[PDB]
């Protein structure tokens, strides 16, 4: 599924990401933009045999099990296929674990490069929240 900006903002808000651990809702919409272009089925294979999955491009090295990433963890306790669902509940649950690490949203390199320190409130302008 490819979400529209506002559709995604509304779902993220229902799933408790507005001001989760200090990060406003716009941060999560912005991150989803530059990670996946709002696409829940997006995947990217990295050089170490891991793959990034779904709308927030969660990496299979640490966070989810795809059964094909060497010397890996499954910190979120889920198959990576659950991060390819149109319903983002499981992605959001895993993202909350990730962001509750010391690194915060600095886990998402695209967020750091394109979102961090910018007026992220633009990403929720005009939306029915």
């Amino acid at each position, epitope marked *: 599924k490819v979400y529209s900006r506002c559709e995604l903002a509304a779902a993220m808000k229902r799933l*408790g990401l507005d001001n989760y651990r200090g990060y406003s809702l716009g941060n999560w919409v912005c991150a989803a933009n530059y990670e996946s272009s709002f696409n829940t089925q997006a995947t990217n294979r990295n050089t170490d045999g891991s793959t990034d999955y779904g709308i927030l491009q969660i990496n299979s090295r640490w966070w989810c099990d795809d059964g094909k990433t060497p010397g890996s*963890k499954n910190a979120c306790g889920i198959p990576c296929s659950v991060l390819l669902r149109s319903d983002i509940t499981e992605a959001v649950r895993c993202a909350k674990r990730i962001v509750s690490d*010391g690194n915060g949203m600095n886990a998402w390199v695209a967020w750091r490069n394109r979102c961090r320190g910018t007026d992220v409130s633009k990403w929720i302008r005009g939306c029915r929240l």
Partner: antibody, heavy 113, light 108 residues
């Protein structure tokens, strides 16, 4: 299954360091985040902190700079060390994983001279 | 810190009847609210996570609802084994905080 068990002293003197251990079964240990929680009389629960598999920590500001939570990856154990204790650190101490699925039994610690 | 206020302080319930328990947050916490039971001489047990998400092995008679500042734990067909303390806990903001607890008493 993931099973937790706390250990450490039941009596510590004021100004000493309180040192507890949480021993974990299974193979999840290096993948999870690991927490300490304590219960005071009057059913007052306090989240003390947690340590992540990357080494990050979050600590309750109530504990100031007295608390450290550390892991030993090589033993499926983690630790609480609380410095300069006072009678106000008298409580039942629990270890738990971060999402709350797995809890130890709780261990009563009295701080008293 | 986020303050969680539970009410009432005590519930007295005849087994077979249903009840609900309230948790109110001092700021909005989205869905980031978790419910625990703590029976006498035992550790807390997670009953509901993220306001309304069910937990494997917990009876379906426990459910959770709410969002923002206002949350409700419901117990349909209360059993004697449900007696003890119930606590809400928020995970929205560090430091995590707990409500002061609601005691469930069995009426007889």
């Amino acid at each position: 299954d993931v099973q937790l068990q706390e250990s450490g002293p039941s009596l510590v003197k004021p100004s000493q360091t309180l040192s507890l251990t949480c021993s974990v079964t299974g193979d999840s240990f290096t993948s999870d985040y690991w927490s300490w929680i304590r219960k005071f009389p009057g059913n007052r629960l306090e989240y003390m902190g947690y340590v992540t598999f990357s080494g990050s920590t979050y600590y309750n500001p109530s504990l100031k700079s007295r608390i450290s939570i550390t892991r030993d990856t090589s033993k499926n154990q983690y630790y609480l060390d609380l410095n300069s204790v006072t009678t106000e650190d008298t409580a039942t101490y629990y270890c738990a994983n971060w999402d709350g699925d797995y809890w130890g039994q709780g261990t009563l610690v009295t701080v008293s001279a | 810190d986020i303050v969680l206020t539970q009410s009432p302080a005590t519930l007295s319930v005849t087994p077979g009847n249903s009840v609900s328990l309230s948790c109110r947050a001092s700021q909005s916490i989205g869905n980031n609210l978790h419910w625990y039971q703590q029976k006498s001489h035992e550790s807390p047990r997670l009953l509901i996570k993220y306001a309304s998400q069910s937990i494997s092995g917990i009876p379906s008679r426990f459910s959770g609802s709410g969002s923002g500042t206002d949350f409700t734990l419901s117990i349909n067909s209360v059993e004697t084994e449900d007696f003890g303390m119930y606590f809400c806990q928020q995970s929205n903001s560090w430091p995590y905080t707990f409500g002061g607890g609601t005691k469930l008493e069995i009426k007889r």
